[PDB]
């Protein structure tokens, strides 16, 4: 809850800093490939397997 | 035949390969007092690239007499260990190591029944223990060191003259290309002439220099000076 | 980071913006996002740069070759078939997603490959952030087309790509592939114009330096 | 975790290791030599995974000395680091060793000291704290480390460094190791803090 | 490569393989030894090739130890019997290791000649060379009965109560018909084994030049030179 | 399990529990935790029985290869080196093996603890198992190097007993070994229940 | 979180006939400097320089490599490496472990064979950009990049450019934990370079 | 015995040299005619290509193209030089791919003739039957079975080697006037008439490297006449 | 032919091996407990060419020392096998190897190429002496055999040293092995160096003895 | 997406749509999805774009090598089975074909998403499949003609286009005949607009 | 792979026994609803949402 804010700047560590820092809330030139945050490639368009049993797959 | 020892306990693949080293262009080196003449004779004339003395590391550098193709081919695999040394240890290795190198897979190739021998010899130009040395490589992969050697054309004129009225007194580089160009003479009267195809390397183990024509005639101005 | 690719009666006309970023920090202001591939194929991409560079050195080398050893123009169906055949084993890992285009013995083609390996021939695309902005003029103003009024539409997708993404750039790269051959405008427009500033300039005693060695080259 | 600090000054080297070997809860010995003297002039331990680290140690050690008889290489501790740097990062992203080393010996430019971490970095510095002492010791080697440092002082200041962690970390520690080389060789001392 | 294969592989009209038939003269060409089996010893005395006297006489042995109770002896190519012992002792503590026993000594004289004639594989580690052997071994051991047996290049083995290899081989062999008789003790028997040696080796018999090995229930016996001393005189 | 090796001027002591447990069932009590591989070397299995067994076993045999190839008996750091290198190869898939290979180098005792993690320690003094906490503690009170033979075998005898009266994962027969210059001898399979 | 364990960072600034190469020299190991004499600038000869950021193992290992291409590519050549090619050199290498990427940056900086600065960078796989202005790497690379801007101008003279970027790298390097307590200039230009090394905070 | 695949074709004479390799020169050597001439400014490239056969001479080439600044031509069996020149198309991407750059002449030059010397050493295997030209960066290397390499002012290979380097010896000058001069001579040497179809040019000048197309081949007989 | 028998029941090509390496500069060697001399035949009357040492270290902890007779290259490989093994052993099992285990081990990787039909064999015999505990000597043949000697010489003249070595009366190892070299090389032709391999030291033994020593069977 | 194939009189009509979702963006509005395996075998591609597309370009060539090994006409079977191979050998490979063609007869082959493979007489596939298994069931009729399976089609994919988000845009369909295959195109204005 | 079997043998813990149990294969009286796994009550038998974009859910 508290955020363990300051931390690293209270203990030796044998980023949590004594101020919080943005974006609390790699290293390649990646960029993006749509504005949508995860796509990258067409959707898989197929009919989906839904219900049936799968805590149950070998009781046919 | 192949490599595989005849009745007489002969490979004579390998001894055809020495032998075949006889036809290449002449190579000759000596150990100085401040270094290691390196000096060879090319068939053709050309400056503009040098062809039978190479480089392998700041510390060693190699002449080359016999079948071109072979002979560039283990310089570029002598080069390619030496710098695998250099990467494994963080420093130059000595003309031992380059030796070792081409002498193995020279004697490799040698003992492969499936393949021939490399028709070609090197003279090895470096030091070990701060004193110059001159190593040398057969195409059977033995290693001998020479105070002074020669392979090629009239490899067994120029190497009896060296063995016979070499003054075997210790001088410094200029005197042993001195002495070096008047064996040539003595043995042979081309090498009085016709000198814009030669290569000489003035070997030290960090300020290593290539000898130009206007050096090379500067020097036969001496023995012009002493055969008169 | 806009891609546009527009096809037109007798050629292509891609488009790209001249950003790279990594983050909220922009790297590169004018970096060239069109990559060659042949004198009649470009591709630009959006993703990994650098697997957008080495999946189109890729194509250039094999399309090179196929050119250099059977003397004939390359196909775009090869390159795009050369990136497939390279981009699906990865299973996207080699994160490239591709905008090819080109003219060839069958015309003008234009593909957009995206990073597990897929094509699609198409008459005109936009990738990278800012395609969404793209798209939506070339969903406006795409018709039958010379490349005059292409140049301008796929100017116009870029431009709405520049102005409305915050990861897309400054510039405007442009290159046509038509059957007449291959042309290329770097920098074709300037929308992100810079304010001029004066240069700020410390005195020469504001640093001071402990210990120089000095090397000379030879 | 585990600790060593080494120093060196004018023709001295001096590398301090403790020499209990314990894992988690248990102390399984106290005096255990944690040293590889290569040739007289060179001197490395071996720190970490104790199954890794003298695996590793062993066949660095043998390597060397193949590489020293066979191919004349010179053994200094450059050489000796950049030996461990390689075989180190050549298991790196696939088989890691969880073991640092500190190698420390005379060459012809005088004494080196090099620390040789879990990944296979290599650096060179005047003085070394590794293990915890990385957090604990290098204020003390910065207060008391000076360029013309004697052997006596040297071996002085890595007995507050050691005690300095006898007091303050709370792993038990009881034995150190040091070993002192130099151009007369190479001086072993063993101390109970 | 196939024609070096196809060479080793090539059958003479008369049948038998070719290299076969080479590997047989080859294994002739050895010192004497001699294999006697009874109800309860076997024995193998084998004669020293000391080429010169300044050769160590311990270390130019001739007898190896396979495993626990089983010893060998060979004449003819004497390079080749280090790897067919080394393939013995690998053989043995396989077999100890899948059941816990020393094996039967036929069971290791079946594996051996299972690997003898494999030299045409490519694969290493079921063939004993790229040839026949140019080796003959009087292999003895002690399983639940004292075993000889004599494995000839040609892979095939046979078990024997008396037979001797090398250049004596046959002259031992028409000696054995009067000088043997399964029934003595192992002391007469000893005698009677280093007498027929002495018939045939090159130079007087004593206890340096001669190995003897007696295999029996309780111990697996190597006799130095002072026992051998002591039955020679 | 808790097993138990030590040296002292007399020889060398070795004692384990004998005692086999999966979970909370005790599938044995009678199970041998040492292995015999010659008369100057032992080892004392701990852990997998089945993985410790196996390595044991097999390093038994490089052990008796090794003496057919050089007519030498084996050292103890060539035969815990052979053991150490057979579980390093196994190292972080969860082989779970710790073992005392003890035996004399001619006149010269050692033990080397080795584990499965490829760690290979020599020592004076070694406990291996659950109960190796509580066998150390009463080793630590009592044991010397200047024990006699008799002393050093009830410490042995005794620091195996406290460790199975107070562990669950031990408590069957106290094995109880003595390896001297001359060989290892069996010297007892007490019940726990009769000391 | 590898690459900020070690720290450090680097600039390279492109004035006229002249490239200003800076580093700092702190190591790091987290929180606690290490040493404060660790250059992370190598230098293959007086006009091909090039430093890394990030495991410090694998740009020690990449200098290696580096170095080992390079002098064969002398050998086989009759002329020097362009900068350019170098770099280019230097994105094949990271791009070859693409599967299991070094972590590192580097900035590759020299002379060209008609003595004109160069400067360049690459990511973890060699997606390499050419700069004709300045370029930064590692932990203060935001900072660095803000303040270069901020007062970089085209074609400022060596000494110059030496004062502007010293000043952005110790602005910079006040303002990152890691960003060290010692630096190293090299002064590069077409007649050699100059290691010049000055301090800044002491903390 | 039937063949065997291990067999060393390639050995030493007693006399000190090897058999197989002077036997592939002499199959380069009898190839058809192609010359090259290195230029104060330039260098050209000329190979006859006969039409024994009903070859489409517009779309066969003698002349090929290694990158943009390298180019090639052979003397000697065509199939070994197809195998030779994807071999340096594979040599010369793999440089592009790692330094971006052009191959400069004496790397490709280096790494081409290890790569076929390779095949002196190989079980099994015969020395490629071709002599190349290599033409590029203002040099010329002639590159021989054996995989021994040298660079020439003026070259030829084929079966008129013995005359044909005459007039390109004695007339090196200016790049055009030189592509005239080396055009000019192959008249004498070629066993009819050349047309423009029979011969195809291959010239390196400034930076890249270009093959004259049939139209420059029949403008550069124009110009003579 | 490789790795094959004759028709006559002989593997010609190892006896082949066994006369080249007979065709080699002679080495001579004679041990005693506690010490091992060994001379070596040289051939340099011609100045130019610089000797090589052909003693050479196998092991220096072990103190294990090597030399040969035969195809030179060869010896290279050898030795370079011999201090692999050393030292993978040491790697292997943490302790030293045995000086008889490693004989077994380098006559075996020379057996290796006398089974290989892609191989030549080996022409060189080997000697492995060592100073430790007690002076030993092994002389691995070409073929793979080896076994221990007390003293011997092997080379181009080996029988002519063995036969005069044989059953000496001399005790002195120094004046054994320098004068059963003396017995044939040709003074001034090929001239004689040896060494004395002691307890973990080793030194040469300088020419002014030999000289005087290989007076009386030179002359 | 919405795919079918229906076997009508002498002859193979299949249908699908343009829309290629990506989220809720369409990637693209005129995707082909009817690919072409030989001049007489089509197939309708579900599942992961590049895996399908990796499987329709392997079998393409396969078609045509057992095709001029045993010089006769490409058969369907033997690219259905050929699909099928890839699609079960690869489970990494998500794809799920329909392969309906004229080689001797009209055939329609169902490469489920497992690798299950099952001859049919009419065919749906995709997300938009879904909402109109009961109006294919109810409305499908042996021996159509042209006309009444073009209808068909037409009614089915434009229920599925309405109903399914990631199904939209104009029918592509296409009927193989013996005597080759022609390309319908149902404009999506129409589809929409109505 | 090996399942680690024994450490709770071989350490003090501060159950892997020393013999392998077949569990590596609660204190309350249960039993079983249903013979089904882990089903005890009727499937909720609507129709389940699927599809549209659930990585970017206010991308409406």
Known sequence: GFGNVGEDDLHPQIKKGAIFSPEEFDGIDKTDIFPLKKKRDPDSDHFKKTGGDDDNPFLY | SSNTFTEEGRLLQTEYAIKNVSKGGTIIGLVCKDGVILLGINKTELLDEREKIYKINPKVYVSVSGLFGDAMLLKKYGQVKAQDFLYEFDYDCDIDRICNFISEKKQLFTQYNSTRPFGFSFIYAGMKNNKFKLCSTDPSGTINEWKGVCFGENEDAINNGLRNDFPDEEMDMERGLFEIFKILSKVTECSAKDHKKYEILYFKNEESRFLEFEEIENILLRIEEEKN | TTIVGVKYKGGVVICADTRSTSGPIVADKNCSKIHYISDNIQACGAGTSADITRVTRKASKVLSIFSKTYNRLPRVSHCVRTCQLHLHPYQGHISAALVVGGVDDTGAHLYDVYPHGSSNSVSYTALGSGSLAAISILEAGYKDMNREEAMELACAAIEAGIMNDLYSGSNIDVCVISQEGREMFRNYKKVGVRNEVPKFQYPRSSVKILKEDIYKYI | MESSVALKGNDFVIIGTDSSVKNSYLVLKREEDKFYNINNKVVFTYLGDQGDAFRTSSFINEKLVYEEIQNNVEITPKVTANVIQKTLYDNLRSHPKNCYFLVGGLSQDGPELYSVDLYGSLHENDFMAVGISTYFCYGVLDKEYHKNITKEDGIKIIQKCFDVLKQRCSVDISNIEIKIVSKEGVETINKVL | SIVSRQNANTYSAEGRLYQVEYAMQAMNLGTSSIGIKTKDYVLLASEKKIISKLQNPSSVKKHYRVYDHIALGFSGISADVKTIVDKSRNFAINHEYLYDENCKVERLLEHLADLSLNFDKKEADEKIFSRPFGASLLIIGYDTEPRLFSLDPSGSYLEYHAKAIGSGSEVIENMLEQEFDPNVDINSGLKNILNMLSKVMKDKINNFNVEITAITKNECKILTPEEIEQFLE | TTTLAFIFQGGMVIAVDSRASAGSYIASQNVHKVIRVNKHLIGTMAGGASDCYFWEKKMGLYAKLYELKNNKRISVSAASMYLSNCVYSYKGQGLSLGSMVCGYDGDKPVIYYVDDAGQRLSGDLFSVGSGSTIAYGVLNESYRFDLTKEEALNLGKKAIWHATHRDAYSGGNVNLYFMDKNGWEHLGTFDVDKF | ?203 | MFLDTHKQLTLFTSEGKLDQCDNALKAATQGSLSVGCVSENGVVLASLKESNNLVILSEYKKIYQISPNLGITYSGCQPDFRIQYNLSLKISEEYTDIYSTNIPIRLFVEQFSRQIQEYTIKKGYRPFGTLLLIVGDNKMYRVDPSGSYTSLQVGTIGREYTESGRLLERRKGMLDDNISTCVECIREYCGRSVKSEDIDIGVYRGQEFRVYSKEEVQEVFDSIN | ALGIFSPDGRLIQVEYAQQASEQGSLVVFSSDTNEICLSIETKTHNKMLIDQNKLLPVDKDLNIWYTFSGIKPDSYKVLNEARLICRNYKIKTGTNISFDELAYELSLYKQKFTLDSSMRPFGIRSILLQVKDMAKIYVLEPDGNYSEYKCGAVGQKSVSVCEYLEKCEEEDIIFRSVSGLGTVVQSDKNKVMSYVISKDEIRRVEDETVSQIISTVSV | TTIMAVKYADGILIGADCRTSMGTYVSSRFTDKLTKISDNIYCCRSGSAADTQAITQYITELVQRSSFIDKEIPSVKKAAMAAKDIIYRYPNMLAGLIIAGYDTKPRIFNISLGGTMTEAEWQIGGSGSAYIYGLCDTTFKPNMNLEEALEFVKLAVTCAIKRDNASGGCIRMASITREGVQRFFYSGDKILNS
Chains 1, 11 share one sequence.
């Open chain 7, 1 to 203: 979180d590898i690459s900020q364990h070690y720290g450090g960072s680097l600039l390279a600034m492109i004035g006229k006939s002249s490239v200003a190469f800076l580093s700092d020299k702190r190591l790091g190991s987290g929180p606690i400097s290490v040493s404060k004499n660790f250059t992370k600038i190598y230098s293959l000869t007086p006009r091909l320089f090039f430093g890394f950021t990030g495991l410090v193992s694998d740009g020690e290992m990449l200098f290696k490599k580096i170095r080992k291409n390079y002098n064969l590519f002398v050998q086989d050549n009759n002329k020097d490496m362009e900068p350019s090619e170098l770099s280019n050199m230097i994105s094949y290498i990271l791009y070859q472990k693409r599967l299991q990427p070094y972590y590192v940056a580097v900035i590759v900086c020299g002379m060209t064979l008609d003595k004109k600065p160069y400067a360049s960078s690459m990511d973890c796989i060699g997606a390499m950009k050419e700069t004709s202005e300045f370029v930064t790497s590692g932990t203060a690379s935001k900072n660095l990049m803000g303040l270069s801007e901020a007062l970089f101008y085209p074609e400022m003279e060596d000494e110059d450019l030496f004062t502007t970027s010293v000043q952005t790298f110790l602005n910079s390097s006040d303002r990152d934990t890691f960003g060290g307590m010692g630096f190293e200039c090299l002064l590069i230009n077409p007649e050699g370079y100059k290691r010049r090394e000055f301090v800044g905070r002491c903390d």
